[model samples]
Structure formats: structure tokens, C-alpha cells
Target: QYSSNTQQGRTSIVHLFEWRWVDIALECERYLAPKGFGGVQVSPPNENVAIHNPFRPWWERYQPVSYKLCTRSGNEDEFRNMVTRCNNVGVRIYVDAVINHMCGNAVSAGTSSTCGSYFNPGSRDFPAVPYSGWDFNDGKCKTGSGDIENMNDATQVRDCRLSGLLDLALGKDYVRSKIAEYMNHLIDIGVAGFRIDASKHMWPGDIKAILDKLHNLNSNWFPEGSKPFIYQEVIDLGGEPIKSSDYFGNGRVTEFKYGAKLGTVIRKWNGEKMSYLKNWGEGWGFMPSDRALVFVDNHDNQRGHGAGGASILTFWDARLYKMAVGFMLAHPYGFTRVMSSYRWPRYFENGKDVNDWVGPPNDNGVTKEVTINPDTTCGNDWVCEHRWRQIRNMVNFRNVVDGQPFTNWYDNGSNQVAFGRGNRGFIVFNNDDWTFSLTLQTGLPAGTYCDVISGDKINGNCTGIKIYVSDDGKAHFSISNSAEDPFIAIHAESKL
Candidate 1:
């Protein structure tokens, strides 16, 4: 299982990838919890195989050699402190569990080696867990090379090695017990949940076997009978033999289609054209509403690593970014996750797969660290899109409207999108190059309201666009690309 499912009526999860433990707690208390976020999805916490090429890439975290807890994100003590502090403040923690495989052959070996491999996934060569050769698949791999290559074949996809990393048999009870032991250790430490990565590549039954062994969360922080929320990263795009539904009974699955849908709709909306907003989710033949985990762009897709573009709204398009996310939360569709990122170069950048808002890494022998550029976005070139006024205000609006089904849908034939969130809040986005006023169905208390997306105020008063709602719920407003963004939202607690 992953982390705790904290539904304070809050509607989202933000992946704080590779963020240090101390920074995570600070952000959770100062930002996430108060703004109504469910929790933070931290990167893999285990000691991973360090990769040193193309600037100490982030994927090295995925190559965990051991679970000693000492790495870039701080040691075990710091991690536990983070989990406690985060939980104390009502925020939960979800871990990225790289359970499928580990380590790839380094191109830079010997004198040219940029990184060192402490544990070889093959032969289960990890001394931390002491997993040996017998822990791996029993030569079922047909790649001739014994690695994962053909995903089309169901047998090899589940039983074979992936990316040359040694595959964990997982079918064995001893292996399952060890995994469960590791997971329960985190649970005992108050960590809420997990993100089962590479699940698509694992046999569903094997995953079930492993989950069955997991212990419950530490009773101190969680309520009695609380099951740690488990969501598997099954990137199913339909047509695949192993669809997202395979993992349904054990946990939630990532809805890859939402990225495409949001990306498509936002483009139309921002272009001053509305194609389809209603019946946008399920009607498109994606995963069922409740079971699918949703996001506009994830660490993989956003960076063009796994599933690229087609239907995704990365940070490239600012106008459509708000509109896509606004529509996602407003419409009562899938369980949502919003992405917060440090600017990297491009997607699939070899090792690091760097985010856009960062500076070059300053290399030191053994320990190489990147110096975050303060002049960039969030002090250290981190683009805290989640902290944007529009996005943050919407988080509150989402929390206020939690549990209610969407109502009063409104879409301007082209480029304008609007919808009600659980009848407790209403949101609208005008993503046009030109500004035009149009009548929108707000479904709110008629009075003076501020367009939250423009800018939320430090004090109670908002400094953004002011919308005057008529006695009836109809509000006439104009949205153009002239402002910072082209979106508007009004929630229950907020007076308009």
C-alpha cells in the first residue's frame, strides 16, 4: 500500500519528487495542509544506485541498492522526522516504491565511471536486504538477453527483466515477506502510503501477494482500521493486454488518458474554442471514475520519458495549464494529482531527466549536488506551480466542495470552459488570446466575488478580477490572455 488517504474534502496529491526531508515537512505545513492538499508523494526513500552521467540524474533514486535510508534526501532519522511532522499537521506521505527491478549497467565504468553500483539487482545482489541470485525470475525471460524488450507478449512482460535491471520474483513468500517488512517499517514510522511504480510490468497476483503481507499504519497517527491507500502506476492506454483494471482489487491505478483529455480540451478552450467538456472523462473510454488516479502531466509523461505528448498539457502552455487543471478538479471525474516541478531541460534527458527550473550540478568527488538557482522561480529554480495563486486558491475551493457531484455545466462553443464542483464551488476558464465578456452560470451566492486565479490576497480580500454575481446565479464576465492567467473560481466559504 502507499500512503494515507486524507480526504478533508481536499481533491489532490502533489508529488514532491526528490525533495529533501526537512524541506518536505516545511512545505507541507506552510503550503499543502493549509491549502487543502491530501498529501505529498515523495520519491523512493531507499538508498539507490547512484548514476553520475548527464549531471547526476534523478533516476538514480530508482536504482535503490539498499534500504539503509542514507542518500540525497537525508538519512533515516531525517526521513522519520519528516513523516512524523507531516502527519502531525494532517498531511499524509506516499512513497514511490520501486519494487519491480533495480540497477542498469553503467556506461561510465572504471576510469570513466560517473557513478558506482553498490548492489547488482541481478542474482538479487543486495546485501542490505541480502537478496541473492535465487530471488530473481527463474529464467523465464525469452529476450535471449534475459531482459524486458517485448511488452506485447504477456508472458515476458510480467516475468522478464526490465531495462536490464534484475527482476524480483515476488512470487516467493520470502521475497514477499521482505517487501512487506520494508513497507510495514515505514507504516510503523507513520508513513501513509505508496506509489507502486513499474506495476504494469509486474504480475498482478505477485503484487497482491506482496500487499497481503503489508502491516497497517502506526496506530498513533492514523485512525483505527485505516488501510494505507495503495495506487499502482499502471500506464494503460487501452488496447494493452494488461489494462489498469488488473490492479483494481489491490489498489488504484493511474489514469493516463486524463492527461490527453485535459491537454486536448485546454487547447480548444485557450484557442477560444470549446469542443467538449461534458461527459469528457468516462465517455472517452478511459478507466472508471473512482478507480483511476489522474494527473495532467506526471514525472514521466511530462518529461516525455514514458508516454509522450499526444494528450498532455505540460508546463509549456501556461494559458491551457490552468484551464486543464481547473476543468479536471471542477468536473467530478478521477482521483487527482497535481504536479509541482523544478524546471528541467527536456523530457528524457538521459540520466537526470531534469526539470526546467534548475541550474547545472556542481560535481564533488563521491557526493555530487546541484546548486538550485535562486534567480529562477522558487528560490532554487523550482517552479512551484502548485504555489501559484490561482492554483492554490483552487485547492481551497476544491476542499470546500469535496464530496458533491458536479452540476450546472457551461461551455462556450469555443475557448471557454466552466463547471460546478460538488455544488459547493463553481469554476470557469477563458483561455483565449482575446478578452471577451460572456454570461456564465456561477451557481453561487449572488454578490461581489473575486476571480481567484488573478491573485489571492495576503489578507482576506482577493486582489484579482472582481465578478459581480446577480441575484440569480448568472455572472457576466470577460476573460482574456491579458492577465497572468485566464481562469476564475468561487468556493463555498468565499463570499462573492
Candidate 2:
């Protein structure tokens, strides 16, 4: 009944990185909605300094130049049209709100536009957003010059510039109003939510004030009085003085603990065994399921940036990732986000400033265009893992088993992990380099179910791990991944 307070019938949201508004609109209707996806978390839709050097690094978009909807993604008109198109199709759009700071000390002098060359790390008096050097907390940062050296100090973390980004005095009314006006624009355009990038760098009260002034999602796209869904990127990896709990009142915090725990389970299933789901959820000390927005990896983390955690799955381990993401969605816990990425090589930098991809991503990012690109699939260095067969199949498995609690838990000492999503679906994973055979539990009435992992079968008979569920709800299953595809999922609906 509230903006994004209510869940969509679709169960997954994809972070479509660097995709323009026109591309997003096409994706929403053609791929997302039909694929049962909940929403698309688009790139920042605001004016930013476009740097083409350093291999055109992805973070250049992180540096804001103005609130005007005129970034690589699209102009205000294009953005508005995309939002309306997506909303009409029942696929929601959530923006990546880059609010904490502006461009760092670098500036390009004598440039007509407020944007600067590497020579000019944006200075005050830039006419782009009509802001000047006086607007930035230049020398006032707790650290020497513009560094965020003191993560332990609340004042420094809040007031200081982060990674050289110009810190805005959000406490000021003008700043607050400006931030609110930008958000209001998004709300008016029909975005259902936001991914508050670097929320960790802002004052909690300051963030609240901006959010407080934001009007609810426009009543046209959403129900009356519905507030926009707010999910913040508060990377609380512990040891940091600022905890994600600080933002719970505002939105779901990305649960990093789950990344490690899930990695443990995956490694165990694939052969680690000892650490498998032993500590599981609570032992790792993460926020509870309700407050947690869970994903194996994120835009920052996959490249060994801010969000990296131990058990994180990238494209390097496609099979393991399939099982990991499948479990995250199928398991009855946490808000799930399906990370759709482009594949990258080790030590690759993401390039969007040149209006193209730059460095190679370690595990996930995008693939090159030379390869045959499927319309529903990704190409040109954009590896959309969400479109993978096993993972996509599991999306249906998660949705089918939506309300059901875990049942028929079966494991072969962590070398294999299998469980049912209530009685509606069943999933099995063979992390072991070799094949496995075991008597599994189906928790369903005896019948042939399609192997959702492989494909809907001929005559309702699946080829992968033919799980034979007895009238008593017990089934026999097995799996094998010979350096190729590894996971297999056969759900009740897929049963023959």
C-alpha cells in the first residue's frame, strides 16, 4: 500500500549498470517484467563530471556536477519517459542516488562547462550546478586537506570529504532543500526507490532531513500516500564506527555478513564441507532477515572495491554463483537482489566516461560484443549473469516457493546442498568438482516434476538429476559439474 513498502509480484531486481534510459525502458517491458523481475536499479540519473582518463573509470559517475537529469543515462525527458514506460509494465525503477559529495579537488581549468579536465578536479565557482568553492568543505575536513582519514570519528566521517569528494554541508537548509528537490523530481517521474550510494559518508540526521522533505511517490504510478522505497548503501563491515543500524529507520541495509556465510556454504558444498552452513545466518553477526538486503556481490565489491566479502560470487565461478544466488532467493530470508553484471577480466576497470567499458572486471561486469549477443542476454563486456539458465530458472523456483518455509533439507556432508522451497520447489547443488548421488527429500506428492534447472522436459520428464518423489515426499537425486555447469534445480511445478 505504501510506495515500495509493498512487494511486487516479481521477485528479483537487477542492477543494470551504465545502461541508458532507452535501454532500460526496453529491458523493463521485454526482459524484466516477463522474467518476473521486480525492478531495475539504474545508474545515477544526474549530471556528473565525465572523465575519460584513468581508462575512463566507473567512479567518475560518482562525482556529481548538477541535479539536472543529463547524464550518460539520459536527459530529463528521456528519463521521465523511461520511468513511465517501466511503471506501466509493472517493473519498478530505483535510482542510484549519489548525494554525499561532489567531484574531488581535481579540476579542468578554462573548460566552458562546469565539468573539468584531469587538470581541473572541480573547484568552487563552477557554474554547472551554480555551486562555488565556498560551497564545499575544502580545508575544513578533519584530515589534512580533503581526505577522510578518520573513519572512527563521526564528525570526520560526516563532515570530511570522502575519497577526495567535495563534502556538501548537508546540515544547511539550502543544501537540504536542493537534495530534496532532486529526489522529488525522481518521485514525480515515478521511480519507486533509491540506492543511496556512499550513505556511509553522510550525517544520519542530514540524510533523514532530505528524506523527510521528499513527497511520497507520485500518486499516479503508486497508491495514494505511498513513500518511495529507500535502500541505502551503508557498508557496515563491522569495526567501522558508523553502523548500518543508523540507517535502518530509513531503509534496508545491504547485509554483508550474508556474503561471507553464503560463500562458506558454497565452498563447503563444492568440497570445503567443514565450514559449510555451520555458522549459517546468526553466528556471523549480521542484521536480521527483515532488515537485510542480501546479494552475493555488488557493483563495488566484485571489483575488490568497497563491498567485497569472503563468500562473494562473481562470474569467475558461474556454477557456484548460480547455486549461491539460487539459495539466497529460494531460502526464506532477506530481501533479494539479483546482480546482473557484465563479465570482466582480472584487475579490469569499468569505463563509462568514454561512453564505453574500460578495464576488465575480475569476475563479473560485461562480455564483449564480438560474441553473439542475445537480445535477452548481455554482450559487449556486459555479462548479465541473471539471464543464466540455472539462475533464471531458480528465479521461478524462488517465486513459486515464496511463502513456504524450508523443508526436506538434505546434504551430503556439505559437498552437496539441497532443500525445498516449502513444498513448491526443490533445489540441489554439487559444489564438489566430481559427481554425487544421494536420496533426497522432495516434500511433495509423488509425481514427475520438470527439472527447472535444465529446461522444461519432454513429456514432463527432466534429464538433469531425475528426482523421484515418493508418495511419502522423499526423492532420490544426484549432481555433477565437470568444470562446466554445476548446479541443478527441479521444482514441484517442473515435476513429471
Candidate 3:
């Protein structure tokens, strides 16, 4: 279950949050596959309630209705079509599976807008999937209020409601089979993997059982006997009682702390030195590379939900955010995923100053179509940060220098930093106050390379910065203090 099921040598996942199946298929063929993106973390594909009170907030997706394959994303047919189409173009799909809980007590027996499935929260009776009271964790939760009031107690966290949502009894044999049945159906439809939501609320033993029952990936896109890649949503900051390492036996974990630490190191918000990155891997209180799934920002933290508050970085500050993402891709850290978002509308459900809870471009609860412009960017109220030339070009750069070690490390004793991906690639950044021009050991064969950050190499020429390496493998690299771009990069594949 550790394999991501991507095409060989491609190594990044873009969380296309709330994108429709048809639009995702279109994006795969038209852009993602061509730019060498490995996979996409699509929103949950199972059935969910259609919320309208606040005009369809995006969090409604966390509320599952049944095991049936239907939701605002699409019907079963549309979803199957998307998986097939995306796979055909070498882009794999990973679902955001919400199995830890069901819809909270937000629906009643009779309403024009209930999720079309029967649910009696008072009795824990859901007849559509036929789960009786015994199928759920009962009212004997350790927390007196039946909600997670104290995060220090592991039992209360597992048994009680997270924000009043209906918690499932995953420890039961019957419940395991039912959840496996839902996931197996998706495996039959060609999904490559899953991102398990709210994983901390369930026991690892129960999760392992469900994984054992899942079918192998569809042989059409993957080799026979290939297992689904599983990464759990476990937000573990240092001082927390529930550490993320507990679930490493199940699969890779979402490294929430990685982003916050990188934000501090990149922003140098607390006067920390970027040179400290010389030992970035496990020394920074992160999980092992193979056991971590990393990202700059996600659907939750970008809007200040779940784990990160204002400390994390997003597209709101393009210059710094781009620099962080560039560093993430350039460095050989955990498996990376990038955030592609839409400009939000109103305040969050929590009343924070940032308004990230609004739904995608929609009309009367129906999701509007996503369109692309001639410049390969998104239209219709999308941020499309993934389409930014520097971001996608760095995706190609990672592919080019795959498996190489970080070398040629140098720092100006403070903010500025430079490093190379073995002999195949080289990069530099000037966060210092003055320009820098130095004869550094590039370690590349004598050749000219195009800087991928400013612009790409085209038609035997470069539209951006150019570097010339001598036979002795030394090059004079320069970065001005006042330049528009704070970084420059080149790789063997970009040699001109």
C-alpha cells in the first residue's frame, strides 16, 4: 500500500480540491500529464449531503451519506469515466476517503435537502447502508459531553465526536467489512489510492483490517499485485499526546509539522537561519522520508482549519509562497503535494478574518464548469498556482534530477543559500541584502543550461538566466539583491 502508482520518474501530487471528475480528466490530458505531475488528490467521491444553509460550504464533503458512489463531484458513471480517462493519460487518481465519521446532527427526518439517505442520529440508525446502533461508538464516551473536549486522552479522541459528527465503530468486524466494501468498489473502478481523513480518531488495528481486504489496483493502469497507496491525515505538532509515528505501521502520514517548520525556515520569521537546512531531513523533527507525505499547504491548513493557523504560508503571499514551494521541490524531502486553490468569498465557518470556507464557483448548489485560458492558466475564480511557470517548471526539474543527492551546499552565513542535485542540476537563491557573484563548483559537464525559474529553454535558446560551465566544472553564478526573482535553477534536461 506504500506505492503511489504513478508513471516512472514522475514525483509530485497536486491536490485539486473540489474539482469535478470530468474537469480533472480534462486537466490530466491537457496539462498535468504533459508537465510530469504524478497524481492528483481528488476530493471524496462517495455520496455526501448537499448543504445550502450557508450556500454550500466546502466542508459538506466531509459528511458521508452512504457507501454508494454519488456526490457533487459526480455520479458513479462520471467518476469511473474520469479515472479511466486520467489513467489513459498517465495521471493517477487518489481519493480523499472520509470513513472516520458521518454527517453531524445537521439533518432531520423530513427536509427538502437531506442527503437522500435515512439517518437517525439519536439512535445511530442508518438504513441506506443498514448500520444499526451497534455499528457506532455509543454514548459511553469518556468525555462527559460526548465530544472531544480534551485531546490529551486517546480514548476520548477515538470514541467521541469530533465537532459533534457521528463517530463510527471501526473496531467491529461487520463495520470493517462494510467500509472495505465501499473501498473495494472504488478499487474496481481504477482508483490508484486514498488519503484517509481524520485518521487519528480511529485505532490503527481497525485501519489495517480494512486495508487487508482491499483489492489490488486495476491492472489496466498498474501492474498486477500493486496495492493502493495509503496516507493518513494525522496532525501531530510536538507537545501533542497523539504522535503521528503511531500510525507508521499502517502507512505514510501527512506531515503537518513539515509545512510549519518550512514556513519558519523560509520566512525566517523568528530569525532562524536558512543555513540550518544543511541538515533538513530527519533532524528537523519530521518522520522518515519514506513514511511522510509532504506539502506546502493543504485544503485544511490553507484556510486555517484542522492544524495550521496563521503560521503557514499560502498563495496570498505569492513571492514567499513560491520560494517555499520551490525549495520543497528542489530539496529531496518527503513525497510532495502542491495546493491548487480558488479565491474564496466570505469568512470561514469559524468567523476568522480569512474566508476560505466558501464553495467553488457554483450556482444554486450546482458546481460550475472550470475553464482554462490560452496561457495555460485557470479561469472562473480559480487560483491555479500549479500553473505558474516556475512551479510547473520545477516539477520538470525534479523529474530530471530524480535520485540525485544534494551537493555543492553554500550559504552566506545567513539568508542566501545555494545547492545542486548531484551533477545533474544546480540552484541558487539570494534572500540576503546584497548581490552575490561567485565561482562555484557546478560539477556538471561543460555545457550551457537554462534557468527554469525565470523562463524555460525553447528553440535552442533560453528566455531566462543562462549559466556556462567550463571543462574544469566551475561557473560564475550571480544573483542581484534587487532582482524580481529570488531564485534561479537549471538541470541536465534543460541544457541548451
Candidate 4:
């Protein structure tokens, strides 16, 4: 469960948010595999409520209508094909399993699901899954509202509905079996694992019981007896009644604090400085590195919907976002996941994006295909941060520096900092108000290396800034605070 089961030498996964299965399959072949990305965390593949009142908001995908492998992303066959193609190219596929509940109880019963499944949430009658009211936690919830009103009460938090979505009675043997059967179907279809959605709303023991019922990975692609990798989404910040550690027994837990704190520091909020990141991982009150799934910002938080506050960096803050993402990839802290998003009409009214619920780039309620531009960026409003020169290079930087120890740490006691991953890679950041010009110890072998943040080294020639390291492993580096990237990175593979 802990292992990502990615191809050897690959280091990070990218969340292709709202991407279709066909698009993802093409991405595995065209970009991810060759770029050295470990895997792709595709959006929830199960059938979900097709919301229309809000004009098909993205949040509707979280409200599962059934375990049927169909959504805006694609149908079961397309999903199966995506997994096979991705796995064949050494890129894995992780599904976003929304098993904690069905649709919201207030939603009227109809055939408004992505797969056209008939489900009545008010009475908890999902004919597709054959789940009735008895399969829910309506009677088990002690809260008067029947929803999670008090986060401090762990029992109610688990048993009650999340924002009025009907909570599933996962403790029931039948419920566990049904959910496991759905997951096992995906496993048999060749999925690497799952990102268990709304895990905090389910009891740990119940989650364990369901996991116990899951079958091993398909032997054709994975080794015999290989367990599917599991990463539970538990938004744990300080003062939360349920800690992320509660789900550690199952697998890796999403370290919400990692992004929140990184955003705060990069934005220079609360007097946080980049120099203070010297003790980044366990020293900064995060989960153990191996058990953590870290990111600078996620699909939820980038739109001001999740744990990270307004300071969370996204593509909107391109310069700072690249710096934060580069720092994250260069550092040896935890398992990393990059967020690939699309552009939305961000209209802020009184400091709030009234259009936060806007769905992906669609036409008349149908999602559009991801079109690639001539420069390799995404068209049709897709941001495709994963394709950015700086970010893509950093992804490879992390791959090159994998398993190397963190060493050669240096900081200006303010926002200027530099660090090396043993001798395989080195990165420097200049978040201060002034230019960062200094000859620093890079701990790299004497060579001419291409700074991947600026451009690529092609045909033995660098298209971007080049750094020359002397025999003593000293390199002269400089970056103005007002520069486009505000940081630089060099790795072993970038050496000439």
C-alpha cells in the first residue's frame, strides 16, 4: 500500500484534474512516460450526479451515484484502456474512489447521473448499486442535522453526512463487500491503486475492513500477491479532532499541512520566510516523509475550497507557483503530486470568486477534449502546469535525485536559500526583495550544467542559463527577485 508501484526511476505523479480517460491514455504515451513522470491521478471515474443548476459544477463529481465506472472522464472500456496503455508505458493510473457516500440527500431522485443510473438520494435508493436506506448512516447519525456539524465530535464526523451527502454505512459487511467489489473490478481492469476520497468521513476500522476485502493487483502487470497502493485523503491541520495518523495504518495520508504551510511561507504571510524551510519535513510537524503525499496546491485548495487558505499558490500565480513547485520537487521530503488544471473565468466579487464552482472547459454540458498547442501547452483553456518548462524539468530533477540524501543546505537568513540533493541536483531560490548573486557550494561534480528552470539542454546545447561548477564543487549563481522564474535548478542529467 505504501509503494506507488511506479516504474523504477520515476518519482512523481500528476493529478490530471477533470481529464478524460482517452486524453489521459494519450498523455501517458505522448508526455508522461517520456518525461519520467511516475503516474497520473485521474479524476473520479465512478458514476456521479450530473448537476446542472450550478451549470455542471466540478463538485458534482464528488457526489457518487453508483460504483459504475463511468463519468465525464469516460466509460468503463475507455478507463480500462487508459489503465492498460498507461501501465504498459511504465506510467500508473490511480483512481479517485468516492465510496464514502452517495449523492446529496436533498437532490431530487432522477436519472441525472453521469452513467444515466437511477438514484433517489432522499430515500437512499440507488438502483444501480441496489443500495437502500438501510445501507446508509441515517439512523446511526446522532447529530440533529444528520450532517457533520461539529468536527470536534469524531464519531458524528464519521457517521453523519458530509454537507448533506448521504453517508454510507461502511461498517456493514454488505457495504464493505459492495465497495470492495467495485474496487476489485477496477483492480482486475489494471488500476495501480486508489486515492480514497472523503476518508476522514469514514471510520478507520471500517476502511480497514473494506481494504481487507480488496483483491491483489492483476498479476499480468504487477507481481503476484502485490497489494494495491492506497492513499487516503484526510485533511488534518492543527486542532483537528481526527489526526491524519489515524489512517496511517492503511497507507499514505494526504499531508494537508504541507501545502498550507508552504503557501504561507512562499507568500511571506505571517512573517514566514523561505530560510525557515531548512527543517522542512518531520522537523516542521509534518507526517513521516514516506507516509506523506505532498503538493503545493491541490484541485480543491487552488479554488479556495479546501484546507489551504487564500494564500495557496496556483497557476494564477505562475511565477511564485513555479518557484514553490520547483522547491517541492527539488527537496527530499515526501511523495509528490503535481496538479494539472484548466483555466476558468475567475470573477472575484468582494474578495470571493463567485464562479468557484465552474466546471472544466465544456460546451453545452459536455467536456471538451484536451487539445495540445504547438508549444506543447494545452489549448481549450487547460493550464497544463505539468507541461511548463520549469515544472517539467523539476519533475525530472526529482527523478534524478531520488534516493540521494539532502545536503549542502544554505540560506541567507531571509528568503534566499539553496540546497543540494547529495551531488545529483541543486536548487536555489530568491524570494527576498533584492537580487540573489553569490558563488555557492553546489556539491556537484565539475561540469557545465544547464539550468532546467530557464530552458532545456538539447543536442548537447543549452537553450537556457548554464552553470559551470569548478573542481571544488563551487558554482556562481544569480537570480533577480523580479525575474520570470525567481529560481534555478540543475541536475545530474542536465550536465553537459
- The numbered model that scores best in lDDT is 4
Per-candidate Cα lDDT values, in order, are: 0.72, 0.71, 0.84, 0.93
lDDT of 2 by residue, 1-496 (tens): 1124434556667887777688778877777777777888988888777654654456667877778887666678889999999998888899999988777666454442213322234546546555666666665675776677877887788888887777877877777887888899898888888888888888778888899899988787777878888888887878987998888878777787776667766766344562255345555587876777788878876666675554667777776777778778777777778887765445434532222335434223221222326555666666777777777777767767767877767666646677776778877767765786777767777887767676656674565546567888776666665735565676656766
lDDT of 1 by residue, 330-438 (tens): 6677777888776655653555344532222223423222233443236544567777666677767767777777787776566666777654677776665577577
On the 0 to 100 scale, the lDDT of residue 213 in model 4 is 93
Candidate 2 local Cα displacement, residue 124, angstroms: 2.0
For model 2, the local distance difference test gives 0.71
CA shift of 367, model 3, Å: 1.5
Q: Sum up the clashes in candidate 2.
A: 43
Candidate 3 C-alpha lDDT tens digits along 142-197: 77777889888888888888988888888888988999999999888898999999
Better of 1 and 2 by TM-score: 1
Give lDDT: candidate 2, residue 259: 69
Q: Stretches of candidate 3 above 4 Å error?
A: 110-115, 346-351
Clashes of each: 30, 43, 0, 0
